Amino acid sequence: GYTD
Amino acid sequence: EATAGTVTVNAITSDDTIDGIELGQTISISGKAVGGDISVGDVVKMTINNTEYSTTVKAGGIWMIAGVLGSDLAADSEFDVVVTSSDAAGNKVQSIGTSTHSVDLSAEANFSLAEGQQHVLTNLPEGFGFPDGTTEVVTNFGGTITLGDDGEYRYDAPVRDHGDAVSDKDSVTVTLEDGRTFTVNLDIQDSAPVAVDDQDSIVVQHEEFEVSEIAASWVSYTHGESVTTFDGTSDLGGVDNDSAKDQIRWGNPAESKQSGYGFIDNDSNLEGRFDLNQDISVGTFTHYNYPVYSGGAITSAEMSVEFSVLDHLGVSTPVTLTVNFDHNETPNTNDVNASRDIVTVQNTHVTFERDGDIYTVQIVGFREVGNPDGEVVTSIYTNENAATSYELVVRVVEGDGYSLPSTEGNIFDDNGLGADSLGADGSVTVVGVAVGAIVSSNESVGHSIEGQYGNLVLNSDGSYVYDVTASVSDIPAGATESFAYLIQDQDGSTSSANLSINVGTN
Ligand SMILES: [Ca+2]
Ligand SMILES: [Ca+2]
Ligand SMILES: [Ca+2]
Ligand SMILES: [Ca+2]
Ligand SMILES: [Ca+2]
Ligand SMILES: [Ca+2]
Ligand SMILES: [Ca+2]
Ligand SMILES: [Ca+2]
Ligand SMILES: [Ca+2]
Ligand SMILES: [Ca+2]
Ligand SMILES: [Ca+2]
Ligand SMILES: [Ca+2]
Ligand SMILES: [Ca+2]
Ligand SMILES: [Ca+2]
Ligand SMILES: [Ca+2]
Ligand SMILES: [Ca+2]
Ligand SMILES: [Ca+2]
Ligand SMILES: [Ca+2]
Ligand code: NA
Ligand code: NA
Ligand code: NA
Numbered sequence: 001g002y003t004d
Numbered sequence: 005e006a007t008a009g010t011v012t013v014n015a016i017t018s019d020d021t022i023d024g025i026e027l028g029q030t031i032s033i034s035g036k037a038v039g040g041d042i043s044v045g046d047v048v049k050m051t052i053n054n055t056e057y058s059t060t061v062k063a064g065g066i067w068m069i070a071g072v073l074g075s076d077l078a079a080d081s082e083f084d085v086v087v088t089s090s091d092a093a094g095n096k097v098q099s100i101g102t103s104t105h106s107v108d109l110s111a112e113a114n115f116s117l118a119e120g121q122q123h124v125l126t127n128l129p130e131g132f133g134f135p136d137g138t139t140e141v142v143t144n145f146g147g148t149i150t151l152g153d154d155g156e157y158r159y160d161a162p163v164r165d166h167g168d169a170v171s172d173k174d175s176v177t178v179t180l181e182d183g184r185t186f187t188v189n190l191d192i193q194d195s196a197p198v199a200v201d202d203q204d205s206i207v208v209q210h211e212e213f214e215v216s217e218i219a220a221s222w223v224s225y226t227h228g229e230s231v232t233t234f235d236g237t238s239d240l241g242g243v244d245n246d247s248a249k250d251q252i253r254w255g256n257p258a259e260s261k262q263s264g265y266g267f268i269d270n271d272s273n274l275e276g277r278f279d280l281n282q283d284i285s286v287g288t289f290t291h292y293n294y295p296v297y298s299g300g301a302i303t304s305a306e307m308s309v310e311f312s313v314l315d316h317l318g319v320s321t322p323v324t325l326t327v328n329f330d331h332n333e334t335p336n337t338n339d340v341n342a343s344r345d346i347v348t349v350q351n352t353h354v355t356f357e358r359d360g361d362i363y364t365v366q367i368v369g370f371r372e373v374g375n376p377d378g379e380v381v382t383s384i385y386t387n388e389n390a391a392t393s394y395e396l397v398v399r400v401v402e403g404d405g406y407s408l409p410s411t412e413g414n415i416f417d418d419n420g421l422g423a424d425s426l427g428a429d430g431s432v433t434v435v436g437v438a439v440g441a442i443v444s445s446n447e448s449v450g451h452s453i454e455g456q457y458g459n460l461v462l463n464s465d466g467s468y469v470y471d472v473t474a475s476v477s478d479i480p481a482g483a484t485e486s487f488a489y490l491i492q493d494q495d496g497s498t499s500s501a502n503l504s505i506n507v508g509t510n
Binding site for chain 1: 333
């Protein structure tokens with residue numbers, strides 16, 4: 001994904 | 005010429021058998037002789053064991069021999085009875101009847117006796133004896149029956165494996181001159197250990213430490229983008245009574261704010277006092293989990309928890325506990341649970357000296373806020389777009405922190421009520437242990453098991469170590485631990501007892  | 009009659013012979017004693025008691029007695033025998041030219045007064049004769057017995061026919065044709073030796077009847081189990089008769093002319097005839105009987109000079113003596121003990125044999129059959137000269141006979145199992153000067157026969161019962169495939173009924177047959185035999189059957193009974201209850205005691209020291217306010221500082225970290233550390237504010241983390249940097253934030257915000265940690269000390273609630281052997285909250289750790297662009301989070305951070313300790317003569321000592329956190333800002337997916345961020349605290353410690361006594365402050369872990377009896381964990385999980393809060397719990401222990409208060413023993417020793425009895429089989433080991441009053445052979449021997457206030461390791465050889473894990477504040481007056489243990493001997497006999505441990509506070 002692109003966020004944590 | 006004369007005609008023969010019918011001779012008949014009744015049973016030789018009621019059971020038609022000569023036994024070992026009758027052997028030494030005089031036995032009357034009887035029968036009848038009727039018909040043909042038989043008449044009252046006719047001679048009746050018989051040869052039994054080459055000895056001649058005779059009588060006459062009486063009224064009603066009854067004949068009876070007053071006394072035949074039991075030993076003759078034992079030697080000769082079949083014989084003819086012959087009556088000699090004469091008719092008118094004077095012609096003679098003989099009428100023959102036959103008798104058979106059984107002979108069994110044996111007698112049994114049956115006993116049920118405990119292994120590994122000497123036993124006087126009572127209620128032996130009448131006439132029992134050894135052949136003269138003999139004072140001992142050896143049994144099938146290697147036991148001995150010995151005749152003593154008091155006329156009493158004593159059996160030394162061997163120890164037996166009562167669990168195996170071999171019968172434990174011993175036997176021996178004694179044979180006498182006159183033909184009698186006596187078979188002594190001795191069913192050897194199993195012996196067993198007797199476990200005896202055990203008492204032990206442990207006292208947990210309860211010292212009070214005078215301590216200053218705490219100052220908690222984020223001092224280092226690995227990785228992260230836009231990382232900031234700062235003293236808490238109303239908007240970011242809440243306020244505390246010092247200027248140390250209790251807040252840390254990181255990440256490029258992908259939605260709103262930065263992720264991070266905050267730690268608000270417990271100075272107000274502690275009121276300047278630590279307690280020994282007590283789980284203590286040094287403050288409230290909050291994990292603030294926001295969505296941040298991938299890669300921008302720390303992977304570890306370290307916080308120093310600094311305070312002073314006073315001794316019994318007003319001298320202060322500075323102490324710094326280093327607290328290490330591993331951080332996992334997980335990739336966010338469409339699974340809320342998978343997307344939670346994870347904080348793991350290390351179980352670090354610091355050792356200090358006060359009045360010459362050494363103490364260790366050790367990280368226990370995270371505990372849910374407001375619940376002193378809650379479970380303490382070392383990893384916590386926080387949803388994206390949420391913050392979770394936990395007390396950061398430490399304990400101060402005596403020494404270098406290698407162990408908790410503990411006591412040792414062996415349940416085979418005399419621990420107040422005497423030592424366990426082992427029985428005659430031997431090979432006794434502890435095969436079960438359990439908290440409470442019920443125990444079976446189980447899989448806890450040699451393992452750590454949890455009691456109410458501590459853990460026990462009891463081994464198969466009876467040795468044990470009990471260590472108190474509960475906080476002093478959780479041990480009521482009169483507190484006791486109870487562990488039931490089961491011992492077992494070579495062939496399966498089991499006995500249980502209780503190890504009771506008085507757990508006091510001081
Ligand atoms: Ca008889
Ligand atoms: Ca006799
Ligand atoms: Ca008789
Ligand atoms: Ca006649
Ligand atoms: Ca005969
Ligand atoms: Ca008969
Ligand atoms: Ca056996
Ligand atoms: Ca046995
Ligand atoms: Ca003790
Ligand atoms: Ca403070
Ligand atoms: Ca402040
Ligand atoms: Ca601060
Ligand atoms: Ca996150
Ligand atoms: Ca995440
Ligand atoms: Ca002890
Ligand atoms: Ca015991
Ligand atoms: Ca054994
Ligand atoms: Ca046994
Ligand atoms: Na008869
Ligand atoms: Na008797
Ligand atoms: Na007798």
